[PDB]
């Protein structure tokens, strides 16, 4: 065989590059940042109709001001979330304040490359970390298993990512409202999803300064879905 921390001739870590392929197989997750808030939405993708879809937890709270959506080998994310939550609360204990969204993301990304021959392999999951703080306001980050993170105005990860990213490129502007951003996530999710989009197989969430991080109910999302279909038919 060969080493776990080996470089390829092109100057890339084999294991990190292979973990990126696993993330492409994962379910779609989209995030959009606005001045009124940041929205996070995911494709649940139940493997069978007998599976109770409400138990599929792919959107997750880290703190009251930071949320998280995932894509790929979702089991790997549990320890990442656990670390993130501990980091956030620990900083709150030491400094009597909320922790910056960038600092939280950086803390999570420090785990990424702690593998070799430490854990045995990289994480097989990508994260969209959305939040708000007083300094840099509403922020959306994309955290990879390479240890790298980019801030985004909007970002899609998972199987329908490249198709959705091209759609976000056209649709995003710096004056989007929250209601507009909610519909835009639903619109783009319905386009890339295999099965027909409804309240049971897709989930929405947002983070605002006032109310903090909230996962939407199936009743609330259903009305946004109905509002979306009517507006598209209206022209």
């Amino acid at each position: 065989d060969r080493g776990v921390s080996t470089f390829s001739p092109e100057g890339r870590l084999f294991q990190v590059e292979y973990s990126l392929e696993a993330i492409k197989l994962g379910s779609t997750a989209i995030g959009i940042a606005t001045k009124e808030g940041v929205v996070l939405g995911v494709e649940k993708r139940a493997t069978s109709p007998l599976l109770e879809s409400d138990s599929i937890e792919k959107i997750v709270e880290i703190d009251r001001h930071i949320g998280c959506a995932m894509s790929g080998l979702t089991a790997d994310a549990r320890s990442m979330i656990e670390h993130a939550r501990t980091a956030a609360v620990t900083h709150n204990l030491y400094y009597d304040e909320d922790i910056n969204v960038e600092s939280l993301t950086q803390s999570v990304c420090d785990l990424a490359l702690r593998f070799g021959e430490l854990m045995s392999r990289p994480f097989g999951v990508a994260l969209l970390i959305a939040g708000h703080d007083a300094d840099d306001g509403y922020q959306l980050f994309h955290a990879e298993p390479s240890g790298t993170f980019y801030r985004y105005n909007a970002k899609a990860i998972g199987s329908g990512s490249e198709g959705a990213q091209a759609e976000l490129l056209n649709e995003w502007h710096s004056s989007l409202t929250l209601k507009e951003a909610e519909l835009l996530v639903l619109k783009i999710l319905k386009q890339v999803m295999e099965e027909k989009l409804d309240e049971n197989n897709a989930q929405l969430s947002c983070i605002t300064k006032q109310d903090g991080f909230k996962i939407y109910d199936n009743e609330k999302t259903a009305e946004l879905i109905k509002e979306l279909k009517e507006k598209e038919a209206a022209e």
């Binding site: 776990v4 294991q15 292979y18 973990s19 990126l20 392929e21 696993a22 993330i23 492409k24 197989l25 069978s48 109709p49 007998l50 599976l51 109770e52 409400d54 138990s55 599929i56 080998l73 979702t74 089991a75 790997d76 549990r78 320890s79 593998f115 070799g116 021959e117 430490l118 854990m119 045995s120 392999r121 990289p122 994480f123 097989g124």
Partner: protein, 240 residues
């Protein structure tokens, strides 16, 4: 200490050791879980190539984790003991610190976390086991049924099956199980479970195990004659 990274990614983005662990689960004897309106029933297959067995002392397929939660499995039997043991210890630890027994979701989450840890730890291979964890939360009458697998993912099911020929019995349950109206009584739920196993098993003699779990730590295992009555009743109605 033995450090080797046994579970690693491949060019196509797969962790083969985890996927090969799923093959061990597919080889294992069938196990089924069906939850009704006020109960959950765990059915299990027992292969009949083993006669001259001592059923008194032979390890039973369904295991109590606490007085209110149970765990059945499919895959490597030796591996399952290690998960069950850890789960039983965590169950007592939770009662000790929180002063309340575990929820079925929490216990499942713990067991799944262990399975996951063995997919990215050095010197260890993944568990060749998938589990069905069922029960009732403390002071709660809503039935709970969960499933775990070697990768570490877990989820809740209205009804579910794992093991060999599980795709056949899952097909049966998908059309026979109504979400709007689950099995109203214990008899109805047990019958549907036995029916689903009879699609795969062979004979309804000493091949099927049934364990009924009801609220407030009310768990009982059915005997041969009791199960045989369901087998006799189903076959007579079938001839129509």
């Amino acid at each position: 200490g033995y450090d080797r990274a046994l579970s690693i990614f491949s060019p196509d983005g797969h962790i083969f050791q985890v996927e090969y662990a799923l093959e061990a689960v597919k080889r294992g004897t069938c196990a089924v879980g069906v939850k009704g309106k006020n109960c959950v029933v765990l059915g299990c297959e027992r292969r009949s190539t083993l006669k001259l067995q001592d059923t008194r002392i032979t390890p039973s397929k369904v295991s109590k984790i606490d007085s209110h939660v149970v765990l059945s499995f499919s895959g490597l039997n030796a591996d399952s003991r290690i998960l069950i043991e850890k789960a039983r210890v965590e169950a007592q630890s939770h009662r000790l610190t929180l002063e309340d027994p575990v929820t079925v979701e929490y216990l499942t989450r713990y067991v799944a976390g262990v399975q996951q840890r063995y997919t990215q730890s050095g010197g260890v291979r993944p568990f060749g086991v998938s589990t069905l964890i069922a029960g009732f939360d403390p002071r709660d009458d809503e039935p709970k049924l969960y499933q775990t697998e070697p990768s570490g993912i877990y989820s809740s099911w209205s009804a579910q099956t794992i093991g060999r020929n599980s795709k056949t019995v899952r097909e049966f349950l998908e059309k026979n199980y109504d979400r709007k109206e689950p099995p109203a009584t214990v008899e109805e739920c047990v019958k549907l479970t036995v029916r689903s196993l009879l699609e795969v098993v062979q004979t309804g003699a000493k091949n099927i195990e049934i364990t009924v779990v009801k609220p407030d730590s009310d768990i009982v295992a059915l005997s041969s004659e009791e199960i045989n009555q369901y087998v006799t009743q189903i076959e007579q109605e079938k001839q129509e």
